[PDB]
Design a protein around this ligand. Structure first.
Ligand SMILES: O=C(Nc1cncc2ccccc12)C(F)(F)c1ccc(Cl)c(Cl)c1
Ligand SMILES: O=C(Nc1cncc2ccccc12)C(F)(F)c1ccc(Cl)c(Cl)c1
Lengths: 305, 301
């Protein structure tokens, strides 16, 4: 019993975190094989950021300008190239702690663990979701750029996020490991704002199934709904549309609990129109949308890494 | 910016998790140097659990009865001893991944990270608090016994908890790494129930300071309170008494935000009286009590 916001064990990623210094800027890098990946904004000054020609800025840099540090050992940079908004620093030494890994780009609603780092040293791990507006509601201070988001699939680390910036509302924006930003963000000092966010419907349904598995049934009702009627109600409450793919992915939880997805949808509909009425679900007075259906199954079945 | 329930990176603890098998029971062990620590109930059957005599049960065991597995390598048990409710299995190999560590016993209200394991393999990491009733509201399934709680301040791992059991209400009980239970719990199938839980007041105050540091000020008010009047109110909502130690501990957060401790107490009294009125504090519609003053400072500065 119990349901917690649980992150993947961070050990495989800790052995990859390095410190990257270029000029006055120090941020984090991801050391995999003989390449250190980091945000390309490490090559920028406060003025450079206003209007940066990154090819022009990088052509002026030499390998010795990048100081890479893995623990108390300085790595030697033997090459540098840029791929989108990530800088790839070729180093002489392959990381002996390089795990089995993949670079994956996630979709909004998908969750991942963030290993927040400062000066190449991991300070904390937490669970996140890629919001429908492509921001993440992370916890980051100055120096956290280059901190990565990941999932574990068996013994394989799937790197899905690299931290680049904090938007004015305090939410976070970053790229996949190929340097492509999530969302309409740019690594330029310009007016940028997170779009109006929506609630990840399939994840709220997964979390309601997790509550039923844990013994919370007060919100259940005798009613069902059509997927079309549910989506009409979801549109009104700034909830993401629920697709047939979402209904299919919730199937195993529906079979285990005995509550069909459209039956759980009628529960969610009543919760949206009437609220919780002073009650809580899994110790929360709000509907939680940062547990995917796979996260609920993994936690309520105990998959290991 | 942002405030999340954040756990310590679990890497230093992952390299210590092993599988411990005794008879039909398989649980987790903590392999540090040449000793594997695990709950002593691994030697029991369901029949023994009602009134087990652990000294009697352990004297009948030999080293080859304990099967210790570290990854895909079987460790050789060369000794066994019991210290309170923890079994210490001496092994023939020192763990090369043993971090700098300490065994620390924590107080109610203290927080820690839990690395939940099954079959000696880590499955997840989450943040917990030792409740005032000495239970933890963990997330554990069968096979999670031996999973540990820890803090990693500096490069030293402070092991503070080892999971032993789940109480009937779904909450969890266990021991420090010296085998002493937190709370009035015993490792036996007798009628045991968690006492009525209370809210960790000092932690809610710390979290209200975290919200002020992050720009949330709607809950602040022009009032202050005496510590005695605050405790008389807080008690009626099942909140733990706030002591002078708690007030002193909140001093740095009070100095940083410019809000006196007893002034933040008056905001808490008002939130308890009114509720949030559809508002949230740090993305939460309830008052959070699982961030200590030390956690708030760590995360915000
Ligand atoms: O916002 C930034 N990073 C931070 C990351 N994460 C959290 C931060 C908290 C405080 C200060 C800064 C933070 C930044 F590095 F300064 C930055 C600024 C502008 C741009 Cl266009 C880019 Cl790409 C990057
Ligand atoms: O409660 C137990 N463990 C589990 C731990 N954590 C969660 C569990 C969930 C389901 C089943 C079991 C769980 C137990 F190991 F079976 C157990 C039972 C009685 C006693 Cl007195 C002792 Cl010391 C230990």
């Amino acid at each position: 019993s119990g349901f917690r916001k649980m992150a993947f064990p961070s050990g495989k990623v800790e052995g990859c975190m390095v410190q990257v210094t270029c000029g006055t800027t120090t941020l984090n890098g991801l050391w995999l094989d003989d390449v250190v990946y980091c945000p390309r904004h490490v090559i920028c000054t406060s003025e450079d950021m206003l209007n940066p020609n990154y090819e022009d800025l990088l052509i002026r840099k030499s390998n010795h300008n990048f100081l890479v540090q893995a623990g108390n050992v300085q790595l030697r940079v033997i090459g540098h190239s840029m791929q989108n908004c990530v800088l790839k620093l070729k180093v002489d030494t392959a990381n002996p702690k390089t795990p089995k890994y993949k670079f994956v780009r996630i979709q909004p609603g998908q969750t991942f663990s963030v290993l927040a780092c400062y000066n190449g040293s991991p300070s904390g791990v937490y669970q996140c979701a890629m919001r429908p507006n492509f921001t993440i509601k992370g916890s980051f201070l100055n120096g956290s750029c280059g901190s990565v988001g990941f999932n574990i699939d068996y013994d394989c680390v799937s790197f899905c996020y690299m931290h680049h910036m904090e938007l004015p509302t305090g939410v976070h924006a970053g790229t996949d490991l190929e340097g492509n930003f999530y969302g309409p963000f740019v690594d330029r000092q310009t007016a940028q704002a997170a779009g109006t966010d929506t609630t990840i419907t399939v994840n709220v349904l997964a979390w309601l199934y997790a509550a039923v598995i844990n013994g919370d049934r007060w919100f259940l009702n005798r009613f069902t709904t059509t997927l079309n009627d549910f989506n009409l109600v979801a549109m009104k409450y700034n909830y993401e549309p629920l697709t047939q793919d979402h209904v299919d992915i919730l199937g195993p939880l529906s079979a285990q609990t005995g509550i069909a997805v459209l039956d759980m949808c009628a529960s969610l509909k009543e919760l949206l129109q009437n609220g919780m009425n002073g009650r809580t679900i899994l110790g929360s007075a709000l509907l939680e949308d940062e547990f995917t259906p796979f996260d609920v199954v993994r936690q309520c079945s105990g998959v290991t890494f």
